[PDB]
């Protein structure tokens, strides 16, 4: 019995763009939540329906682990009932959200001086999104280009400042329980 | 609940050093932001400079960058706030204060910058 | 430097009346403003911060909002405790600024 794949998730080199945000799922193994709580690196640590404490001693039936970049005074976006350009048109989180939200500043990394146009998001659509869709496009709009990039650079201050976020939805289906907390020696 | 207070000399000659010591109380200074905020005589609040809990992530104000050493000493659970070559014009009353952050049960969330706690404020006076 | 411009120097008002602040910032600070009180030779304590988020503990009358740069704070109903000095800040930027002040003067 071996722990979580959280190691390649948190620490990956590159993240996807917001509009293709990547989505994997653990499946079997036991998930250490608490160290990712403990740990020092995260700016926010938002948790919707279940207690992060409680969090631990929990086991449900299979959980995904959405990951994109996000800009800083977005974060705030990615919460369950809120508006905006991205919560919007790029990601979209459902009423009844069970899962958590991490989030941590990546400006030494995920900027470049030169200004890294990389990353990218969904500026028009003809309609908001159902929750947890994604969708990649390239028509154009009925006047444009819908995705438009960012342009991070690490002069700009901490609303333009590249932020890693990674959205933890656990399920909890009727096929059995496989991804318990560790139990204790 | 935590706690923050000064310590220091209230009167610093011209030309020397300035040493300052905020020792916090009732909770671990890691993990947290903490910052030194000066106030001069009738006028508005300034900043000086700011610290992390651990790691020691700092940061200076451009204005006196080359006058200000913040240094941070986890085993006494405090920090400490040095300045050289201080003129007249430094008279200031100086508080230590907390980078914000607000524990709910669920979870928490990081403020990137505002003060929630503060210290009683050491006014210090600099005359020949 | 990001400098911090509250407009009314001196507000002169009565009790128990509506009361309104400015905070006026020279470039866009992203809804990075936290707003303080202070009484006279006393510690400030912090009111407002991410513009529009109470702090623990303090009163429902007071109230933050604005984006860009255009910030405001708003006392629906005043006490005889709440004549002080009200302090802007920014943190978008590591030149964090405090603004100049303003005073609740009782009529």
């Known amino acids: 019995t071996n722990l979580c794949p959280f190691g390649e998730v948190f620490n990956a080199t590159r993240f996807a763009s917001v509009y293709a945000w990547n989505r994997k799922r653990i499946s079997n193994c036991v998930a250490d939540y608490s160290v990712l709580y403990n740990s020092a690196s995260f700016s926010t640590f938002k948790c919707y329906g279940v207690s992060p404490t409680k969090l631990n001693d929990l086991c449900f039936t299979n959980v995904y682990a959405d990951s994109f970049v996000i800009r800083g005074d977005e974060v705030r976006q990615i919460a369950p009932g809120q508006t905006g350009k991205i919560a919007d048109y790029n990601y979209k989180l459902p009423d009844d959200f069970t899962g958590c939200v991490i989030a941590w500043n990546s400006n030494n990394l995920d900027s470049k001086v030169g200004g890294n146009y990389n990353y990218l998001y969904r500026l028009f659509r003809k309609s908001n999104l159902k929750p947890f869709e994604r969708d990649i496009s390239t028509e154009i709009y009925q006047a444009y280009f819908p995705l438009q990039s960012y342009g991070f650079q690490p002069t700009n201050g901490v609303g333009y400042q590249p932020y890693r976020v990674v959205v933890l939805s656990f399920e909890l289906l009727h096929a059995p329980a496989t991804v318990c907390g560790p139990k204790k020696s | 609940q935590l706690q923050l207070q000064e310590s220091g000399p209230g009167l610093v000659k011209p030309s020397e050093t300035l040493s300052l010591t905020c020792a916090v109380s009732?909770?671990?200074?890691?993990?947290?932001?903490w910052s030194w905020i000066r106030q001069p005589p009738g006028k508005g609040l300034g900043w000086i400079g700011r610290?992390?809990?651990?790691?020691?992530?700092?940061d200076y104000n451009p204005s006196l960058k080359s006058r200000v050493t913040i240094s941070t000493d986890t085993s006494k659970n405090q920090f400490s706030l040095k300045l050289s070559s201080v003129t007249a014009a430094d008279t200031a009353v100086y508080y230590c204060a907390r980078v914000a952050y607000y524990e709910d049960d669920y979870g928490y969330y990081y403020t990137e910058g505002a003060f929630d706690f503060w210290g009683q404020g050491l006014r210090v006076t600099v005359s020949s | 430097e990001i400098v911090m411009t509250q407009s009314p120097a001196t507000l002169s008002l009565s009790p128990g009346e509506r009361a309104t602040l400015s905070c006026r910032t020279s470039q866009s600070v992203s809804s990075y403003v936290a707003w303080y009180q202070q009484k006279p030779e006393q510690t400030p304590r912090l009111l407002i911060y991410?513009?529009?988020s109470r702090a623990t503990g303090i009163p429902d009358r007071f109230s933050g909002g604005g984006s860009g740069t255009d910030f405001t704070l708003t006392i629906s109903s005043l006490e005889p405790e709440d004549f002080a000095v009200y302090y802007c800040?920014?943190?978008?930027?590591?030149?964090?600024?405090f603004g100049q002040g303003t005073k609740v003067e009782i009529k």
């Open positions: 009732g909770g671990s200074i890691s993990r947290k932001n």
């Open positions: 610290i992390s809990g651990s790691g020691g992530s700092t």
């Open positions: 800040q920014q943190y978008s930027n590591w030149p964090w600024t």
């Open positions: 991410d513009a529009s």
